């Protein structure tokens, strides 16, 4: 029930049971590999890849069609990105919020929400400590985000 409010939401996907094939789809596994790796340099994020893959071509999930899970694949190919993608939207949100707090120090709602958010991050950053996918020590630093992306 979402970890920050009074809210008990339910809504995901009801991956379907079949492990193998769609059958109705008859194109190749190699085929979508190529496609993702096509996409990536252009300017991707794995989250989006699937969406784009789903809405246009055969696919159903990368997952059936290959024995991997997008990322894995980009990582083999070296396109993983320096960041674990979900993070690179949170930090972003930081900058994008803090900035707004500073045009209008007379705003609380916003304030709180910022924190809240500093925290999403520390916890998620503690995990992508733990498991060898952030060089140890990483710590998040409020002010260092604006030449980390632009």
């Amino acid at each position: 029930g979402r970890m920050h409010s009074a809210g008990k939401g339910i809504s995901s996907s009801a991956i379907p049971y079949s492990r193998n094939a769609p059958a109705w789809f008859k194109l190749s596994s190699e085929s979508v590999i190529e496609q993702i790796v096509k996409y990536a340099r252009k300017g991707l994020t794995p989250s989006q890849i699937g969406v784009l893959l789903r809405d246009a071509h055969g696919v159903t999930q990368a997952r059936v069609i290959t024995g991997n899970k997008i990322m894995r694949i980009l990582k083999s190919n070296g396109l993983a990105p320096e960041i674990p993608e979900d993070l690179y939207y949170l930090i972003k949100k930081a900058v994008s919020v803090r900035k707004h707090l500073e045009r209008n120090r007379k705003d609380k709602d916003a304030k709180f929400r910022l924190i809240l958010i500093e925290s999403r991050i520390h916890r998620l950053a503690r995990y992508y400590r733990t498991v060898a996918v952030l060089p140890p020590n990483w710590k998040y630093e409020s002010a260092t985000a604006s030449a980390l992306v632009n």
Binding site: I10, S12, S13, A14, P16, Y17, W24, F25, V51, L52, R54, D55, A56, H57, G58
Partner: protein
């Protein structure tokens, strides 16, 4: 009810009940092989777009994304699968 086979109930009672409880979960959304009229091409679109996809290349448009299901244009056979 003092009792009931909940294994297999009616087909009814599933169609209406919520995706995530028919027992074994399964999706509602499903895919839909589109001839824009001009070309014969056939693009494999999804019932819930999010994207409008273009058809194959003709640059055409197709199906807008809304709350859940595309609204597809006029031309489109949209045979399901």
């Amino acid at each position: 009810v003092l009792v009931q086979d909940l294994l297999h109930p009616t087909a009814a009672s599933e169609a209406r009940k919520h995706k995530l409880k028919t027992l074994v979960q399964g999706p509602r959304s499903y895919f839909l092989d589109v001839k824009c009229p001009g070309c014969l091409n056939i693009t494999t679109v999804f019932s819930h777009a999010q994207t409008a996809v273009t058809c194959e290349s003709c640059s055409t448009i197709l199906c807008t994304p809304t709350g859940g299901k595309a609204k597809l244009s006029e031309g489109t056979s949209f045979r399901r699968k």
